[PDB]
Symmetry: D2
Subunit: 107 residues, 4 copies
């Protein structure tokens, strides 16, 4: 029963809206990923892990006016897109302590 | 640093929008309270505590179409409104285990 | 997967040890539960307990002092008018946060 | 007030005991940190550790077996090419969740 955790957020945030349903971008490559509504309380960076291989952190793109934010894999895979044959994992990085939390995954 | 808790919700909910900024309803009485956007994953009941005195739980009103939900204190104070001289506390009640979590307070 | 919440506690507490394995105490006659004891209880706050007997809220009472072996005992006689609770009813014991009044279920009998 | 998260752990774990008080191990010469030891570590999963030395990610290695007294030791020599880390750099030790790959800071040196 996770509701104590749920309402702890509600207690501390009061009002909060987020969408991390991922919008992956294609031909047999995944070039990027977009989140419709990201959290903005901190300047979060992102880490991409490609089929188990860690591509590191890069600095985030700006958050859009409709609240969306884009993670472009080309800045992470040295200019190449990633083949859908591989699994991809996208972590939010906490700029204060460097913690990272999985927020998206591809097969 | 509460962000691990924050992104645990994000992990498990992906998409989630809530507003518990309270809209208290008045002449020197607080008749009710409204939340603009409540959580709906469970049929949550509400408990009202009046200046330290516990008024118990009652069954919730339906959630509106714009996502709002109203807590009417008259069903809790035996028909009387509550005087603003008193502090009021409104708890969400988890219908599975009966846990309760403070979500609103008046002076 | 809730390891994030777990290690959020670990980072904030660094060192923490608890045991809320319920130890149900029987009265006289045996078919009466008159207490609950926890081997090790969190002590960062003076927590309180609420007992709910077969749907009926017996209310909140201040919690007995913590024992030297870290244990604490909820005495049902304080909540149920000097009688223990028949062991056919379901009993629920909530921990009450003295600061905000939140309550969290920690023990339940049938 | 985060007692809700706390008692969410208590309800799920019932019984739990940990100590991540860092015990920094010095090498030769003394001005080198070559290990970190934790007196009691969570064992519900085979956790892994990542060391970050003065901003440089030394990566993830599998964690030494847990000792009989519940303790576990992160050996920096495994991450830093057989040399210990100069105690003027800041060292960060993250716990890695083997299931999803999340990482949580548990220790930090200056």
């Amino acid at each position: 029963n996770d509701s104590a955790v749920l309402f702890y957020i509600v207690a501390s945030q009061k009002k909060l809206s987020f969408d991390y349903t991922p919008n992956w971008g294609r031909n047999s490559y995944i070039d990027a990923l977009t989140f419709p509504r990201v959290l903005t309380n901190k300047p979060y960076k992102y880490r991409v892990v490609k089929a188990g291989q860690d591509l590191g952190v890069r600095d985030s793109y700006s958050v859009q006016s409709d609240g969306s934010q884009k993670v472009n894999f080309l800045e992470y895979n040295a200019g190449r897109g990633i083949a859908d044959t591989q699994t991809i994992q996208v972590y939010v990085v906490d700029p204060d302590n460097g913690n990272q939390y999985l927020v998206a995954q591809w097969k």
